[PDB]
């Protein structure tokens, strides 16, 4: 059928008295080639954004950067020591005893005890952040620097597992279903309106004030 001339047939039809039929004849030819071919688009696996919006029920409008959310503390991340960096122990004078810089425990009688602690594997490491869960299952990481306006050493100094905390979304990662968050009171208040959504171009800030 690919070698047949359909334009001549269409012209013949027009001269006979059927009107224009170029498209009708071409459709009949395409039909003879694979009768009823499902014109529907082939199946495709849901992409990353589709999977996220599907098994989380979130969308760019409901879940976006700068939004306030209410998460729950769940876990803590730490930075464990090295292999031979045990000579960094410091004789903390506030307690008059040796102290490890990884766990910040100033209660070791001697550097030998510090090395024994290192070897025993009881050193959890220097805390990095706090892990939280959102109502939609997304995970939330709050680095120690973004845990509050005031400087904090370890998470032991604020909140703990099983506490509800209001945080603000800084960054999102869809492939991992995670969000780098922050609960600093400065950010929650938004002093300079840095995280709030953009307002209309014709907003009346004067009337608001």
């Amino acid at each position: 059928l690919k070698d047949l001339d359909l334009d001549a047939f269409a012209e013949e039809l027009e001269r006979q008295g059927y009107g224009d039929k170029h498209i009708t004849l071409y459709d009949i030819r395409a039909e003879l080639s694979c009768r009823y071919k499902d014109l529907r688009t082939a199946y495709r696996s849901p992409n990353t954004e589709e999977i996220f919006n599907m098994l989380t029920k979130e969308t760019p409008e409901t879940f976006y950067i700068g939004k306030l959310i209410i998460c729950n503390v769940t876990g803590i991340a730490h930075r464990r020591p090295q292999g031979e960096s045990y000579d960094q122990a410091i004789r903390n004078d506030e307690t008059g005893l040796w102290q490890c810089p990884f766990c910040q425990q100033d209660n070791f009688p001697e550097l030998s005890e510090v090395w024994n602690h290192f070897d025993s594997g009881s050193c959890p490491g220097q805390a990095i952040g706090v892990k939280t869960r959102l109502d939609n299952g997304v995970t939330g990481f709050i680095p120690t620097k973004f845990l509050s306006d005031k400087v904090v050493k370890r998470p032991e100094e604020r909140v703990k597992v099983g506490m509800t905390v209001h945080c603000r979304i800084m960054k999102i990662d869809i492939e991992k279903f995670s969000a780098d968050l922050t609960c600093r009171t400065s950010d929650l208040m938004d002093r300079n309106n840095e995280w709030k959504l953009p307002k209309d171009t014709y907003y009346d800030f004067d009337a608001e004030a």
Binding site: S45, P46, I51, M54, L55, T56, G137, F177
Partner: protein
């Protein structure tokens, strides 16, 4: 694994309720890989479908 090896469907789908769908799909894919190791099957394929 018994049910799959006995019936042998062409594709498995999982409801997308929450994030547990990730673990379910991972498990189905691990089962499929273990069955394809010895060539018990020939790749059935696992997908995630909206359950609305």
């Amino acid at each position: 694994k018994k049910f799959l090896l006995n019936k042998k469907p062409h594709v498995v789908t999982v409801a997308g309720e929450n994030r547990d769908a990730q673990m379910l799909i991972e498990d189905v894919k691990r089962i499929v890989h273990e069955l394809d190791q010895g060539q018990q099957l020939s790749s059935i394929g696992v997908e995630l479908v909206d359950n609305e």
